Design a protein around this nucleic acid. Structure first.
Lengths: 176, 176
RNA sequence: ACUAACAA
RNA sequence: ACUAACAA
């Protein structure tokens, strides 16, 4: 029974609590939320060959569409959207690049510092996998073919997804 | 992960707790336990016709096999076995008849008192259903064909089921 | 209800 | 590890 209200009555169930009890909740929460969006499926082959790591830097077109905030849409509230995506694909999703950090200031200092090399590239979405080739290509190409969706600006009033998160946010905020 | 130990670590999870939190547990518990026994499936048709009530008094053969305690085997610890059976069939399972009540004394007084008429019949297992005919016959004949199993004395050392409950008991007892 | 995860 | 539910 993945209802909106009862979901709000779940987050608060979780607010007061925080060894299986927690996990018990995290499952449904995710399961609810998944069902929320899925109202808007193949299976991986058995591993073949030595383990491989696959990346795909996917740049966001702020050069093309500066005004639109892609990044938020992707990450979502508590970064959950980005979190549910790593979950259902297996690929490590992470936002790197120029302007990654919301703050312009903090970013203006980490340049060159190890593991901040990525700050010298234009803004992108990084998608990494560790798995056997035939099993990873699929994993990758699943998440690849999903960020591209998020790298396409649904005009306001038609971005159903935007409202989805924004209501989720306004619940974590408790302002609604 | 329906493991025995973790199950014991569940009942005690439940001991300390006692609005969804409780229910959350009751599901797995049942689900675990079901999986426990199922290591030792059709679907009902859509209702057709006016609702009906079906019974089947099923007598236990103490006349034939006095020494063996059928009744316990059926009910099980906390009556759960009898409880999981009402669950998975839909039929109201209940033990009535002579010697129903463990105590001979208490029973020796309720004779004739309304809803204790059943004390004047030999010991039996009562199985009742409320549903449309075609849908109830199946429901009944599922539970019917399962009590008869429990009305057949598995000799000691071969009654795997007996140990199943007895370990479950010895957990609720906390003696193991 | 304008999201900030991830990485350190 | 010898079960006691259900019904009242």
């Amino acid at each position: 029974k993945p209802t909106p209200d009862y979901l709000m009555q779940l987050m608060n169930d979780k607010k007061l609590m925080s060894n299986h009890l927690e996990r018990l909740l995290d499952e449904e929460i995710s399961r609810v939320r998944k069902d929320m969006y899925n109202d808007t499926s193949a299976e991986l082959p058995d591993a073949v060959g030595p383990i491989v790591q696959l990346q795909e830097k996917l740049y966001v077109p702020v050069k093309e569409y500066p005004d639109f905030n892609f990044v938020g849409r992707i990450l979502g509230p508590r970064g959950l959207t980005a979190k549910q995506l790593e979950a259902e694909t297996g690929c490590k999703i992470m936002v790197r690049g120029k302007g990654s950090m919301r703050d312009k200031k903090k970013e203006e200092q980490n340049r060159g510092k190890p593991n901040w090399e990525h700050l010298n590239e234009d803004l992108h979405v990084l998608i990494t996998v560790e798995d056997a080739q035939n099993r990873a290509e699929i994993k990758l190409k699943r998440a690849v073919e999903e960020v591209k969706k998020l790298l396409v600006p649904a005009a306001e009033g038609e971005d159903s997804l935007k409202k989805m998160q924004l209501m989720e946010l306004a619940i974590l905020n408790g302002t609604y």
